Amino acid sequence: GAPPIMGSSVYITVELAIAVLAILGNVLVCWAVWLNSNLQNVTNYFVVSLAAADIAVGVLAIPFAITISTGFCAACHGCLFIACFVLVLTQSSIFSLLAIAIDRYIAIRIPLRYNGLVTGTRAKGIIAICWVLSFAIGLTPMLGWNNCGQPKEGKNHSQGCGEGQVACLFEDVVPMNYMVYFNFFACVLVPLLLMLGVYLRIFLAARRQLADLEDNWETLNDNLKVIEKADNAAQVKDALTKMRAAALDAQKMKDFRHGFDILVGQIDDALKLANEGKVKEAQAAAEQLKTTRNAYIQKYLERARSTLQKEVHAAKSLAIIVGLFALCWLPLHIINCFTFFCPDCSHAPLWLMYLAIVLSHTNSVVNPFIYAYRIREFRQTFRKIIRSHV
Ligand SMILES: CC(C)CCC[C@@H](C)[C@H]1CC[C@H]2[C@@H]3CC=C4C[C@@H](O)CC[C@]4(C)[C@H]3CC[C@]12C
Ligand SMILES: CC(C)CCC[C@@H](C)[C@H]1CC[C@H]2[C@@H]3CC=C4C[C@@H](O)CC[C@]4(C)[C@H]3CC[C@]12C
Ligand SMILES: CC(C)CCC[C@@H](C)[C@H]1CC[C@H]2[C@@H]3CC=C4C[C@@H](O)CC[C@]4(C)[C@H]3CC[C@]12C
Numbered sequence: 001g002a003p004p005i006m007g008s009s010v011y012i013t014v015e016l017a018i019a020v021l022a023i024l025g026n027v028l029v030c031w032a033v034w035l036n037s038n039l040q041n042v043t044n045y046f047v048v049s050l051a052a053a054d055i056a057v058g059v060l061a062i063p064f065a066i067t068i069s070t071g072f073c074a075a076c077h078g079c080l081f082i083a084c085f086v087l088v089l090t091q092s093s094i095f096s097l098l099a100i101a102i103d104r105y106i107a108i109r110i111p112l113r114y115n116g117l118v119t120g121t122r123a124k125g126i127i128a129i130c131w132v133l134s135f136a137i138g139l140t141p142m143l144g145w146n147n148c149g150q151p152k153e154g155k156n157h158s159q160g161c162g163e164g165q166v167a168c169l170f171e172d173v174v175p176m177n178y179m180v181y182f183n184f185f186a187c188v189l190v191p192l193l194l195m196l197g198v199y200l201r202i203f204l205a206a207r208r209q210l211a212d213l214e215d216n217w218e219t220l221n222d223n224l225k226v227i228e229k230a231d232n233a234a235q236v237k238d239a240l241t242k243m244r245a246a247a248l249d250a251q252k253m254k255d256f257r258h259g260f261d262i263l264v265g266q267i268d269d270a271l272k273l274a275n276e277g278k279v280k281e282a283q284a285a286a287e288q289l290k291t292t293r294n295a296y297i298q299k300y301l302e303r304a305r306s307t308l309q310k311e312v313h314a315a316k317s318l319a320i321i322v323g324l325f326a327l328c329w330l331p332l333h334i335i336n337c338f339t340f341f342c343p344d345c346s347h348a349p350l351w352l353m354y355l356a357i358v359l360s361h362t363n364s365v366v367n368p369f370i371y372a373y374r375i376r377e378f379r380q381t382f383r384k385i386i387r388s389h390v
């Protein structure tokens with residue numbers, strides 16, 4: 001009924017509004033990573049590659065998505081590039097998110113070998129090998145998995161296109177078995193479940209390790225209570241062998257390697273008294289541990305539970321990015337499955353189709369907002385840039 005120019009004028013104005021915020025937002029992220037030296041870690045090299053794929057949305061993907069909506073006349077091998085360039089961009093964001101999840105898992109499971117396993121020179125190479133495979137995954141329709149060989153000649157004659165030209169529409173050049181099996185299932189859904197399995201192993205490793213330092217502290221504070229309330233030298237010997245193993249395993253620096261060394265010294269000095277026969281002398285040597293327990297060991301566990309809880313806060317922030325990438329791209333993929341798995345169902349309405357395309361494009365703006373709300377370093381560099389560069 002209504003002229004298609006009225007409906008499409010709403011779409012282009014909304015598309016150009018997303019392109020403005022996708023270039024303005026992610027350019028502040030890339031600018032802060034090179035303006036600040038605290039943001040130049042390996043984890044943020046994948047953040048830049050994520051923002052570089054969200055800048056390309058406002059430069060190429062959104063302008064391409066407008067042209068394909070008009071259904072203009074184009075060669076069926078050129079119409080594929082306008083249609084499938086987004087699939088390369090979505091494939092790079094998935095590979096970057098997957099690299100951030102394993103980067104945070106290597107740092108939480110192996111904190112003493114991170115600086116040797118995960119280096120910047122190796123990260124720049126992993127990024128280059130992901131972009132190549134992103135073009136191989138997103139542009140593999142052009143390799144021969146097309147509907148170009150089966151043209152809709154009813155729409156090509158009405159449009160009045162040339163020889164070898166097809167009315168350039170998305171669902172008329174790339175088949176749906178590619179969008180559901182290869183694109184959604186094998187290349188989007190499986191890596192999404194892997195990030196959910198990697199992140200669950202991050203909060204599980206931290207939750208087990210947060211309980212270990214408190215179990216050790218509980219062991220060192222109550223076995224000490226057994227010493228001053230003991231009636232035998234062997235009862236003091238038993239409590240010390242546990243306090244020596246628990247402390248040495250609490251050890252697994254700045255006053256760290258010194259105060260813990262005072263603990264093992266006083267313990268082993270009280271072990272020779274209990275094994276010799278002097279009970280009252282060993283119970284007095286164990287009270288010397290209380291001072292070190294309130295000066296060095298209390299300040300080690302205080303910082304260990306502080307650095308381990310911030311890795312819980314930081315991993316939760318990056319996990320929301322995986323949750324917002326799915327909430328913005330699954331609605332478009334679910335409509336695809338209805339079109340392919342239920343031929344008896346009617347197609348989704350066009351207002352819902354372009355609602356799923358616009359929503360999937362709004363994913364290029366949410367990421368710089370998560371950094372400014374849940375990362376203090378990014379929130380301060382941004383404020384430093386906006387106030388100074390004005
Ligand atoms: C910043 C740079 C890389 C952007 C330039 C790439 C763009 C503008 C180029 C590269 C490939 C080109 C497309 C490939 C083939 C065709 C088929 C033709 O019948 C209509 C134009 C169309 C659809 C071209 C439009 C312009 C195009 C999309
Ligand atoms: C959190 C996110 C994933 C929620 C996604 C909700 C969307 C993608 C779901 C919820 C209800 C679904 C719709 C329910 C029924 C129909 C009618 C059918 O003839 C076409 C598909 C269509 C229109 C479905 C498309 C997908 C749909 C719109
Ligand atoms: C959080 C992630 C895993 C959600 C994944 C949802 C996908 C894999 C599932 C959830 C609901 C499912 C759809 C629900 C109903 C129908 C209608 C039926 O006639 C054909 C299959 C179809 C279209 C299903 C296809 C697969 C489907 C879209």
Ligand SMILES: CC(C)CCC[C@@H](C)[C@H]1CC[C@H]2[C@@H]3CC=C4C[C@@H](O)CC[C@]4(C)[C@H]3CC[C@]12C
Nearest residue numbers: 180181185189190193337338340341342343344
């Ligand atoms: C982990 C794996 C095994 C489960 C997830 C795969 C699911 C979501 C996919 C894989 C194969 C798909 C099915 C393949 C074909 C059909 C027949 C069609 O008439 C109804 C939809 C239906 C039934 C699809 C529904 C969704 C489906 C079951």
Ligand SMILES: Nc1nc(NCCc2ccc(O)cc2)nc2nc(-c3ccco3)nn12
Nearest residue numbers: 086090169170171179332333336353354357
């Ligand atoms: N199904 C689909 N359609 C479109 N646009 C075509 C909109 C349309 C759909 C039907 C119709 O008759 C006329 C126009 N863009 C699309 N992008 C995607 C997509 C991108 C990433 C994953 O799925 N799926 N998708």
Ligand code: NA
Nearest residue numbers: 053054089093
């Ligand atoms: Na992206």
